[PDB]
Amino acid sequence: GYLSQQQNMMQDYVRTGTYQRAILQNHTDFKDKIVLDVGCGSGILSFFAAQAGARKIYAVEASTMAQHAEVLVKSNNLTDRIVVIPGKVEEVSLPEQVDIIISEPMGYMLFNERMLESYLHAKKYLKPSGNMFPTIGDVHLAPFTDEQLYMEQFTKANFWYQPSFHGVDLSALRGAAVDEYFRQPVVDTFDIRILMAKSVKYTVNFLEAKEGDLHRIEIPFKFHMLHSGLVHGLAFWFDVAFIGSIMTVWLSTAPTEPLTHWYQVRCLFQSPLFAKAGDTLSGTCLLIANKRQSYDISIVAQVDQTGSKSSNLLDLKNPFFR
Amino acid sequence: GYLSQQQNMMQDYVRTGTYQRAILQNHTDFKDKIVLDVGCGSGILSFFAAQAGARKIYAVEASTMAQHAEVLVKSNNLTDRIVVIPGKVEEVSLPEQVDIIISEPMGYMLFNERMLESYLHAKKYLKPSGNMFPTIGDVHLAPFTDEQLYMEQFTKANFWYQPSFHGVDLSALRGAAVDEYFRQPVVDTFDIRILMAKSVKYTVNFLEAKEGDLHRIEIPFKFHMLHSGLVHGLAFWFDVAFIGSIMTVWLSTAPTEPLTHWYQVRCLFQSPLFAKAGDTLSGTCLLIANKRQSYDISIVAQVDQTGSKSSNLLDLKNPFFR
Ligand SMILES: [Hg+2]
Ligand SMILES: [Hg+2]
């Protein structure tokens, strides 16, 4: 819980701006309503709800951060509208059902850090027919070609393919190194020209979802290739929508959108799949929740026409940055 | 413990070449001797001991890097000379007392990550009149002038002096922020032109030092000023020596020597001190250990002739890269 971290999140104008934009333009959803702020991370969220004219804002509240919020609430003259309860939703108690829940629970590929579970858990404190900001989450995935990124892996791992690095033969660990390097999802951004087919969408309606739904989360796909080339993996990004009474407002991390701190995520295939235009690449992406507040990512994919296959396991716990 | 981190360590050619130089050039220290590799940092140290002709090399390594070390031992046909023992030194048992202990226990400012405490605890397995590689550690410090780095930090902290960020007053958290930003040391290299006095030296002898004992570490300094102007902070770096039987080999981290993955480190004061050529800048650097794996550092500085004071609490558990 560093202020540096909190600053970095505040600096993301798309994040902070869109959140604020969504709350103020949907004024009638906040005017004299009771709100719960479970997320933050920018720490600025319960203030937006005050600016939209909320009656009471219960704000929990991670052990840092509880104190950071406490100072700003006092200094912004809002002690009588915003209460700061240190801790976490599955650990604390609220004295009142709320109209709206607000939070910033999105990680890399939306689900990383598993904060949405705590978010969905908060619906124990939600009044019937109340809503949540954000309301839904659209995960997008599409196949990509990128020779330079694929090759990059082997140039790295080939360091181990030396028989006499300072008189030591490292070659027996080359295979383990390749596996490891391919096991990391790549966080950075790309030109859309590397996208081989139109993206499929997978939608989580936060208003109806139970927190158990986020433990397995299976995403099937049947891409219809626009371009001829080699598929090196699947690209991932996400959108969330703030569906209010007045207006639905979108926060998008698409590669066609201005850059955010979430960038985009690419999961490579260990064996590239050749596909033609008009060919269908099908398979499923499986995200298993793991013990390190992250996901084990399983990707199986085949080119229907040729029957070539892979067969790929990632751990979002150890992402490669760029 | 990822291959890759290990690969990063290895690719530091100064570090790897110097460790080999130290061992091979002091072969009479290893020839037919019993060695303890406690690092291990990069699995590679045991192999140097093996190249030097050690009779038996026990290598205490963590889990999982114990596996990766074993693979290399078998594939390099050294299974009769290198014995991997999984776990930690303050846990495991050795069938024998050892002639030499070898390790890579250095972090930033030398002491970071408190690996040295494991290193000195290994003296348990050391024969009387045994040796350690490295034998001693020299911490150098020098006052520096760097106008650009100072205001660069201050203007980042300056974010938190803001009466209306999306309608929110952050002003009250300035000072918590400034404290945080100036607590983090700057890991960077620099031109030696910025050095405002010849360095002073603090020696920690590993052969005699008790794990006690590296929990406090009081470093006094008394610089002769050489150049007039503003002292923006203190620069720190470490030399480490392998005092073998044939010759002493130094691994230097100094800004005058080729670059290493350790770079150099700087505490910048929250407020620069003015000093003239001929003046004395005296004071102490305190390194109070903490739970879990880092130091709380108290830098007390004054110009004798004035005497303008500075006291700053710097926290290693960050820091600021570049
Ligand atoms: Hg918050
Ligand atoms: Hg320092």
XYZ file of C-alpha atoms and ligand atoms in Angstrom:
646
model
C 0.000 0.000 0.000
C 2.392 2.702 -1.228
C 1.248 6.178 -2.287
C 3.402 5.671 -5.383
C 1.145 2.743 -6.329
C -2.016 4.717 -5.564
C -0.642 7.652 -7.580
C 0.069 5.414 -10.591
C -3.549 4.225 -10.595
C -4.827 7.798 -10.249
C -2.594 8.824 -13.205
C -4.386 6.416 -15.554
C -6.767 9.010 -16.969
C -8.892 6.432 -18.792
C -9.415 4.519 -15.537
C -9.976 7.505 -13.232
C -11.792 9.642 -15.821
C -14.197 6.928 -16.998
C -15.033 5.937 -13.419
C -15.811 9.559 -12.551
C -17.624 10.139 -15.858
C -19.836 7.116 -15.135
C -20.779 8.223 -11.622
C -21.530 11.906 -12.283
C -23.486 11.404 -15.537
C -25.577 8.774 -13.740
C -26.424 11.270 -10.993
C -29.890 9.827 -10.249
C -28.252 6.509 -9.297
C -26.349 8.243 -6.482
C -28.487 11.194 -5.356
C -29.392 10.505 -1.686
C -28.591 6.805 -2.158
C -26.517 4.546 0.118
C -23.313 3.350 -1.544
C -20.638 0.772 -0.765
C -17.052 1.292 -1.955
C -15.293 -2.080 -1.727
C -12.538 -1.478 -4.275
C -10.692 1.815 -4.623
C -7.011 1.315 -5.390
C -7.003 4.878 -6.621
C -8.625 5.662 -3.250
C -10.581 8.444 -4.963
C -13.817 6.564 -5.684
C -15.915 7.346 -2.613
C -15.326 11.026 -3.408
C -16.917 10.708 -6.867
C -20.012 9.230 -5.168
C -20.041 12.241 -2.821
C -19.763 14.588 -5.834
C -22.806 12.865 -7.355
C -24.578 13.569 -4.049
C -24.669 10.283 -2.143
C -26.268 10.284 1.317
C -23.932 7.789 3.009
C -20.876 6.015 1.619
C -19.523 2.998 3.506
C -15.938 2.467 2.340
C -13.928 -0.693 2.967
C -11.066 -0.640 2.904
C -7.760 -2.496 2.669
C -5.244 -2.389 5.519
C -3.134 0.525 4.337
C -5.022 2.725 2.817
C -7.685 2.633 5.482
C -5.577 5.428 7.015
C -4.904 7.138 3.651
C -8.640 7.350 2.999
C -9.249 8.582 6.576
C -7.000 11.626 6.155
C -8.516 12.689 2.809
C -12.092 12.298 4.077
C -11.299 14.584 7.018
C -9.427 17.074 4.816
C -12.235 17.132 2.212
C -14.872 17.873 4.929
C -16.815 14.625 4.383
C -16.664 12.777 7.744
C -20.489 12.816 7.832
C -20.995 11.162 4.432
C -18.077 8.740 4.167
C -17.216 6.120 6.801
C -13.930 4.217 6.443
C -14.071 0.622 7.699
C -10.587 -1.008 7.540
C -10.388 -4.645 6.390
C -12.245 -6.733 3.789
C -15.893 -7.479 2.854
C -15.794 -11.169 3.830
C -14.371 -10.112 7.213
C -16.270 -6.908 8.151
C -19.882 -6.012 9.052
C -22.198 -3.373 7.557
C -25.185 -1.911 9.458
C -27.257 -1.285 6.319
C -28.069 -2.605 2.847
C -26.783 -0.359 0.050
C -28.298 0.816 -3.257
C -25.085 0.695 -5.332
C -21.732 -1.054 -4.978
C -18.678 0.576 -6.562
C -15.167 -0.845 -7.007
C -12.071 -1.131 -9.188
C -11.518 -4.912 -9.118
C -10.000 -5.437 -12.592
C -6.599 -7.140 -12.946
C -4.671 -8.214 -16.054
C -7.094 -10.147 -18.309
C -9.808 -8.743 -15.984
C -9.590 -11.632 -13.490
C -5.998 -11.480 -12.239
C -5.548 -10.933 -8.466
C -9.071 -12.376 -8.063
C -10.538 -9.134 -6.697
C -13.870 -9.615 -8.498
C -14.714 -12.465 -6.102
C -14.680 -10.051 -3.142
C -16.721 -7.732 -5.366
C -19.366 -10.407 -6.024
C -19.198 -11.351 -2.331
C -20.324 -7.781 -1.523
C -23.804 -8.507 -2.942
C -24.616 -9.920 0.507
C -24.944 -6.240 1.474
C -26.855 -5.180 -1.639
C -30.556 -4.258 -1.568
C -32.788 -6.197 -3.973
C -32.711 -4.699 -7.496
C -29.760 -2.466 -6.559
C -26.885 -2.271 -9.033
C -23.096 -2.389 -9.348
C -20.476 -0.154 -10.931
C -19.087 -1.735 -13.001
C -22.160 -3.726 -14.011
C -20.694 -6.168 -16.550
C -17.322 -7.340 -17.863
C -16.598 -8.380 -21.442
C -13.421 -10.406 -21.904
C -12.193 -10.462 -25.500
C -9.806 -12.895 -27.136
C -8.459 -13.187 -30.703
C -5.722 -15.149 -32.473
C -2.518 -13.330 -33.382
C 0.607 -13.728 -35.474
C 3.909 -12.315 -34.197
C 7.124 -13.996 -35.351
C 9.384 -11.562 -33.453
C 7.637 -12.273 -30.125
C 7.663 -16.034 -30.734
C 11.347 -16.061 -31.703
C 12.191 -13.781 -28.759
C 11.359 -16.717 -26.445
C 13.866 -19.091 -28.000
C 16.655 -16.520 -28.245
C 16.243 -16.074 -24.474
C 16.033 -19.781 -23.623
C 18.896 -20.641 -26.020
C 21.241 -19.048 -23.478
C 20.979 -22.414 -21.715
C 22.016 -24.255 -24.867
C 25.728 -23.808 -24.183
C 28.048 -26.774 -23.509
C 30.701 -24.607 -21.830
C 29.437 -21.374 -20.287
C 32.336 -20.780 -17.874
C 33.117 -24.490 -18.301
C 29.589 -25.597 -17.431
C 27.172 -27.402 -19.754
C 23.741 -25.800 -19.264
C 21.970 -27.560 -22.147
C 20.094 -30.020 -19.903
C 17.983 -27.087 -18.596
C 17.147 -25.573 -22.026
C 13.821 -27.444 -22.264
C 12.796 -26.327 -18.772
C 13.683 -22.748 -19.704
C 11.607 -22.819 -22.912
C 8.628 -24.176 -20.945
C 9.051 -21.506 -18.282
C 9.333 -18.652 -20.805
C 6.253 -19.880 -22.683
C 4.379 -20.270 -19.406
C 4.310 -16.482 -18.922
C 1.551 -14.389 -20.477
C 3.015 -11.341 -22.196
C 1.867 -7.944 -20.950
C 2.274 -5.158 -23.519
C 0.400 -3.588 -26.450
C 0.304 -4.272 -30.189
C -0.878 -2.981 -33.542
C -4.245 -4.478 -34.512
C -2.693 -5.671 -37.804
C -1.383 -8.772 -35.962
C -4.956 -9.913 -35.195
C -5.807 -12.912 -37.387
C -9.580 -13.060 -36.787
C -12.438 -11.075 -35.205
C -12.487 -11.399 -31.406
C -14.950 -13.588 -29.543
C -16.453 -12.208 -26.336
C -17.031 -13.769 -22.916
C -19.355 -11.828 -20.627
C -19.607 -11.758 -16.845
C -22.774 -10.061 -15.624
C -21.667 -8.963 -12.143
C -25.299 -8.394 -11.151
C -26.227 -12.075 -11.561
C -22.860 -13.854 -11.154
C -22.008 -15.810 -8.003
C -18.409 -15.687 -6.767
C -17.969 -19.434 -7.376
C -18.407 -18.772 -11.117
C -14.949 -17.204 -11.111
C -13.156 -20.350 -9.929
C -13.294 -22.284 -13.204
C -14.622 -19.961 -15.932
C -14.472 -21.845 -19.293
C -14.214 -19.844 -22.551
C -14.915 -21.791 -25.763
C -14.020 -20.244 -29.137
C -14.452 -20.764 -32.871
C -12.448 -18.163 -34.793
C -13.049 -17.672 -38.500
C -9.717 -16.559 -39.923
C -9.585 -13.266 -41.824
C -5.929 -13.658 -42.769
C -3.555 -16.383 -43.905
C -0.586 -17.027 -41.601
C 0.777 -18.699 -38.472
C -1.136 -18.413 -35.206
C 1.355 -17.878 -32.365
C -1.188 -17.586 -29.572
C -4.234 -15.714 -28.323
C -4.476 -12.005 -27.522
C -6.642 -10.864 -24.577
C -8.211 -7.592 -23.466
C -11.322 -6.414 -21.626
C -14.141 -3.895 -21.344
C -16.386 -3.092 -18.399
C -19.679 -1.224 -18.587
C -21.315 1.083 -16.060
C -25.027 0.560 -16.770
C -26.831 3.352 -14.900
C -30.384 4.717 -15.050
C -29.376 7.666 -17.233
C -26.474 6.317 -19.266
C -24.333 3.247 -19.929
C -20.621 4.176 -19.849
C -17.771 1.961 -21.061
C -14.207 1.498 -19.865
C -12.310 -0.324 -22.616
C -8.772 -1.725 -22.712
C -9.013 -2.704 -26.388
C -5.904 -2.371 -28.617
C -8.031 -0.003 -30.775
C -8.472 2.185 -27.663
C -6.033 4.589 -25.949
C -3.512 2.811 -23.711
C -4.277 2.006 -20.055
C -2.152 0.407 -17.310
C -3.808 -2.946 -18.108
C -2.237 -2.949 -21.604
C -3.108 -6.231 -23.291
C -2.211 -9.864 -22.605
C -0.893 -12.470 -25.027
C -0.650 -16.195 -24.345
C 1.678 -17.900 -26.807
C 1.412 -21.392 -28.231
C 4.438 -23.669 -27.865
C 3.690 -24.924 -31.383
C 2.426 -22.349 -33.950
C -0.679 -23.329 -35.934
C -0.830 -22.658 -39.645
C -4.260 -21.409 -40.689
C -5.761 -20.176 -43.958
C -8.278 -17.410 -44.560
C -11.720 -19.016 -44.277
C -10.273 -21.749 -42.059
C -11.712 -22.201 -38.570
C -9.504 -22.223 -35.467
C -11.432 -23.765 -32.575
C -10.741 -24.842 -29.005
C -11.302 -23.603 -25.460
C -9.535 -21.314 -22.996
C -9.727 -22.545 -19.382
C -8.923 -20.325 -16.402
C -8.486 -22.300 -13.187
C -8.216 -20.234 -9.997
C -4.937 -21.061 -8.214
C -3.470 -20.692 -4.712
C -1.395 -17.587 -5.549
C -4.334 -15.183 -6.083
C -4.130 -15.859 -9.836
C -5.087 -18.160 -12.705
C -3.683 -21.241 -14.371
C -4.516 -20.662 -18.003
C -5.146 -23.669 -20.215
C -5.413 -23.205 -23.975
C -6.208 -25.944 -26.477
C -6.623 -24.972 -30.132
C -6.938 -26.735 -33.464
C -7.240 -25.758 -37.103
C -10.375 -27.695 -38.066
C -9.373 -28.229 -41.707
C -5.873 -29.634 -41.074
C -6.299 -31.024 -37.542
C -3.083 -29.533 -36.126
C -3.102 -29.028 -32.375
C -1.794 -27.332 -29.173
C -1.973 -27.586 -26.043
C -0.766 -24.721 -23.801
C -0.553 -23.977 -20.087
C 0.195 -20.553 -18.611
C 0.426 -19.042 -15.139
C -0.805 -15.461 -14.880
C 1.080 -15.236 -11.555
C 4.323 -14.670 -13.469
C 3.519 -12.319 -16.370
C 6.265 -11.061 -18.683
C 6.192 -7.281 -19.036
C 6.874 -6.427 -22.715
C 13.102 -19.518 -8.154
C 12.855 -19.083 -11.913
C 15.473 -19.969 -14.475
C 15.686 -16.485 -16.022
C 16.331 -14.767 -12.706
C 19.177 -17.280 -12.460
C 19.980 -16.498 -16.105
C 19.983 -12.803 -15.251
C 22.526 -13.379 -12.482
C 24.741 -15.428 -14.815
C 24.661 -12.909 -17.669
C 26.364 -10.401 -15.333
C 29.807 -11.250 -16.731
C 31.746 -9.181 -14.197
C 30.040 -11.056 -11.351
C 30.408 -14.504 -12.964
C 33.955 -14.004 -14.314
C 35.202 -12.558 -11.003
C 33.748 -15.422 -8.969
C 35.445 -17.888 -11.290
C 38.719 -15.909 -11.272
C 38.622 -15.877 -7.437
C 38.110 -19.627 -7.127
C 40.355 -20.890 -9.958
C 43.258 -18.548 -9.132
C 43.031 -19.753 -5.537
C 42.827 -23.453 -6.412
C 45.006 -24.636 -3.498
C 42.072 -23.479 -1.380
C 39.783 -25.937 -3.173
C 42.019 -28.804 -4.363
C 40.991 -31.922 -2.390
C 38.997 -29.833 0.089
C 35.416 -29.993 1.382
C 33.308 -27.022 0.237
C 29.958 -25.518 1.237
C 27.940 -23.671 -1.426
C 25.240 -21.802 0.485
C 24.097 -19.097 -1.992
C 23.416 -20.304 -4.421
C 22.124 -17.338 -6.496
C 23.264 -18.963 -9.714
C 23.743 -22.742 -9.391
C 27.135 -22.161 -10.984
C 29.398 -21.708 -7.892
C 29.697 -25.401 -7.058
C 30.955 -26.053 -10.582
C 33.773 -23.536 -10.104
C 34.723 -25.347 -6.879
C 34.596 -28.554 -8.945
C 36.803 -27.051 -11.660
C 39.284 -26.155 -8.899
C 39.439 -29.783 -7.754
C 37.386 -29.824 -4.550
C 36.974 -33.347 -3.148
C 33.375 -32.787 -2.064
C 30.966 -29.871 -2.495
C 27.778 -29.766 -0.428
C 25.335 -27.339 -2.025
C 22.465 -26.108 0.147
C 19.830 -24.722 -2.225
C 16.159 -23.741 -1.882
C 13.193 -25.697 -3.266
C 12.809 -25.652 -6.386
C 16.247 -24.519 -7.538
C 17.572 -27.710 -5.947
C 16.050 -29.669 -8.849
C 17.657 -27.430 -11.502
C 21.029 -27.731 -9.748
C 20.725 -31.530 -9.644
C 19.963 -31.754 -13.389
C 23.203 -29.837 -14.113
C 25.263 -31.962 -11.687
C 24.222 -35.216 -13.430
C 24.568 -33.832 -16.977
C 28.018 -32.392 -16.186
C 29.127 -35.761 -14.704
C 29.950 -34.320 -11.253
C 27.607 -36.501 -9.241
C 30.529 -37.872 -7.175
C 31.826 -34.384 -6.358
C 28.780 -32.127 -5.950
C 26.075 -33.083 -3.473
C 22.899 -31.012 -3.527
C 21.241 -30.735 -0.117
C 17.733 -29.179 -0.344
C 16.560 -26.634 2.239
C 18.289 -23.936 4.300
C 21.581 -23.955 6.270
C 19.907 -23.129 9.604
C 17.777 -26.237 8.986
C 19.759 -28.981 7.232
C 22.620 -31.172 8.482
C 26.010 -31.797 6.879
C 27.886 -35.108 7.296
C 31.170 -33.230 7.633
C 32.854 -29.982 8.638
C 34.123 -27.850 5.718
C 37.361 -26.121 4.644
C 35.702 -23.317 2.645
C 32.289 -21.678 2.389
C 31.385 -20.033 -0.934
C 28.324 -17.835 -1.532
C 26.692 -14.972 -3.438
C 25.121 -13.146 -0.436
C 25.170 -9.572 -1.814
C 22.114 -7.416 -2.499
C 21.900 -3.651 -3.045
C 24.029 -1.651 -0.569
C 25.505 -5.133 0.090
C 23.290 -5.910 3.087
C 19.845 -5.979 1.429
C 17.798 -9.205 1.688
C 19.862 -10.241 4.744
C 21.367 -13.255 2.940
C 24.617 -12.484 4.770
C 23.012 -13.710 8.003
C 22.573 -17.166 6.471
C 26.157 -16.896 5.210
C 27.571 -16.156 8.664
C 25.327 -18.806 10.241
C 27.051 -21.355 7.996
C 30.280 -20.744 9.971
C 28.711 -23.477 12.123
C 29.976 -25.991 9.523
C 33.408 -24.366 9.198
C 36.631 -26.073 10.302
C 38.950 -23.939 12.465
C 41.362 -21.917 10.254
C 38.833 -22.326 7.422
C 38.151 -19.619 4.822
C 35.147 -17.782 3.343
C 34.651 -16.589 -0.245
C 34.001 -13.657 -0.163
C 36.111 -12.993 2.943
C 35.265 -9.337 3.642
C 32.799 -6.665 2.483
C 33.664 -2.996 1.963
C 30.828 -0.478 1.858
C 31.860 2.832 0.298
C 29.907 6.063 0.664
C 30.333 9.477 -0.976
C 28.265 12.704 -0.854
C 26.833 13.719 -4.223
C 25.391 16.651 -6.159
C 22.513 15.868 -8.537
C 20.051 18.706 -9.107
C 18.022 16.834 -11.755
C 17.425 13.753 -9.597
C 16.250 15.805 -6.628
C 13.535 17.880 -8.339
C 12.589 14.759 -10.339
C 11.706 13.035 -7.048
C 10.167 16.167 -5.500
C 7.866 16.778 -8.484
C 6.605 13.198 -8.260
C 5.864 13.752 -4.547
C 4.362 17.077 -5.640
C 1.413 15.182 -7.102
C 0.131 14.898 -3.508
C 0.119 18.666 -3.102
C -3.090 19.287 -5.055
C -6.229 21.057 -3.831
C -8.491 19.600 -6.527
C -7.660 16.347 -8.343
C -10.960 15.375 -9.995
C -12.477 17.624 -7.299
C -10.478 15.964 -4.486
C -8.013 17.670 -2.158
C -4.892 15.496 -1.762
C -2.912 18.243 0.006
C -3.036 16.592 3.437
C -1.172 13.517 2.170
C 1.779 15.564 0.977
C 4.423 14.879 3.589
C 3.315 11.311 3.861
C 4.118 11.201 0.132
C 7.351 13.234 0.264
C 8.484 10.985 3.119
C 7.730 7.863 1.065
C 9.427 9.013 -2.162
C 12.547 10.232 -0.368
C 12.652 7.057 1.726
C 13.256 4.996 -1.406
C 16.869 4.730 -2.598
C 17.631 5.365 -6.261
C 19.175 2.352 -7.983
C 21.069 3.839 -10.874
C 24.565 4.474 -12.134
C 26.119 7.938 -12.394
C 29.158 9.860 -13.641
C 31.872 10.132 -10.952
C 31.889 13.904 -11.603
C 28.870 14.164 -9.264
C 30.943 12.858 -6.347
C 31.721 15.757 -4.037
C 34.345 13.991 -1.864
C 36.557 10.889 -1.821
C 34.606 7.920 -0.426
C 34.844 6.602 3.126
C 34.946 2.857 3.810
C 33.053 0.554 6.186
C 34.486 -2.975 6.400
C 32.497 -6.034 7.481
C 34.742 -9.072 7.873
C 32.750 -12.266 7.249
C 35.453 -14.509 8.711
C 35.065 -12.880 12.155
C 31.609 -11.250 12.221
C 28.922 -13.106 14.153
C 25.345 -13.434 12.875
C 24.482 -11.221 15.858
C 25.149 -8.459 14.869
C 24.282 -7.618 11.282
C 21.003 -6.488 12.842
C 22.343 -3.015 13.731
C 25.331 -1.875 11.556
C 26.387 1.686 12.463
C 28.365 3.451 9.711
C 30.067 6.729 10.713
C 31.264 9.149 8.033
C 33.529 12.210 7.918
C 34.022 13.637 4.407
C 36.489 16.325 3.320
C 34.527 18.408 0.856
C 36.792 19.094 -2.193
C 34.034 21.086 -4.009
C 31.566 23.814 -2.949
C 27.812 23.490 -3.510
C 24.673 21.546 -2.624
C 24.955 17.982 -1.336
C 21.770 16.276 -2.529
C 22.527 13.008 -0.712
C 24.858 10.045 -0.204
C 25.990 7.543 -2.837
C 26.659 3.973 -1.702
C 28.471 1.032 -3.320
C 30.307 -2.137 -2.273
C 33.560 -3.949 -2.983
C 33.802 -7.587 -1.975
C 37.096 -9.455 -1.573
C 38.114 -13.070 -1.945
C 41.174 -13.336 0.287
C 42.580 -16.650 -0.870
C 45.942 -18.296 -0.290
C 47.572 -17.354 -3.634
C 45.966 -13.936 -4.211
C 43.148 -11.548 -3.331
C 40.484 -10.925 -5.981
C 38.090 -7.970 -5.754
C 34.568 -7.803 -7.076
C 33.951 -4.058 -7.285
C 30.603 -2.250 -7.648
C 32.218 1.245 -7.816
C 31.041 3.828 -10.413
C 34.679 3.871 -11.613
C 34.589 0.148 -12.471
C 32.520 -1.655 -15.155
C 28.765 -1.833 -14.492
C 27.101 -4.719 -12.578
C 23.467 -5.790 -12.007
C 23.832 -4.161 -8.560
C 24.371 -0.746 -10.194
C 24.836 1.877 -7.461
C 22.547 3.324 -4.762
C 21.705 6.838 -3.446
C 19.869 8.336 -0.453
C 18.848 11.793 -1.429
C 18.002 14.114 1.460
C 14.544 15.712 1.593
C 16.529 18.935 1.732
C 20.002 19.490 0.206
C 22.851 20.700 2.418
C 25.238 23.499 1.425
C 28.950 22.848 1.876
C 32.179 24.601 0.886
C 35.456 23.116 -0.378
C 37.436 22.377 2.784
C 34.411 21.741 5.011
C 33.684 18.518 6.875
C 30.420 16.631 6.422
C 30.072 14.302 9.387
C 27.349 11.959 10.634
C 26.188 8.354 10.860
C 24.365 5.879 8.649
C 22.270 3.467 10.778
C 20.959 0.176 9.401
C 18.350 -1.258 11.771
C 17.083 -4.660 10.583
C 13.354 -5.458 10.322
C 10.871 -8.309 9.922
C 11.174 -9.773 7.336
C 13.924 -9.299 4.799
C 15.349 -5.762 4.631
C 16.705 -2.739 6.535
C 15.474 0.506 8.065
C 18.245 3.059 7.462
C 18.700 6.336 9.383
C 21.028 8.855 7.678
C 22.143 11.643 10.031
C 24.347 14.261 8.326
C 25.786 17.658 9.288
C 28.271 20.242 8.030
C 30.684 20.787 10.941
C 31.449 24.422 10.066
C 27.843 25.670 10.122
C 26.445 23.182 11.111
C 23.473 22.508 8.856
C 21.823 19.168 9.776
C 19.895 16.497 7.859
C 18.157 13.407 9.249
C 16.453 10.970 6.850
C 14.886 7.542 7.340
C 15.409 5.392 4.208
C 13.671 2.024 3.671
C 15.314 -0.670 1.515
C 12.078 -2.681 1.035
C 11.233 -0.528 -2.011
C 13.277 0.861 -3.944
C 13.222 3.105 -7.036
C 14.757 1.465 -10.119
C 16.292 4.041 -12.518
Hg -11.854 2.988 -1.604
Hg 22.476 5.929 2.067
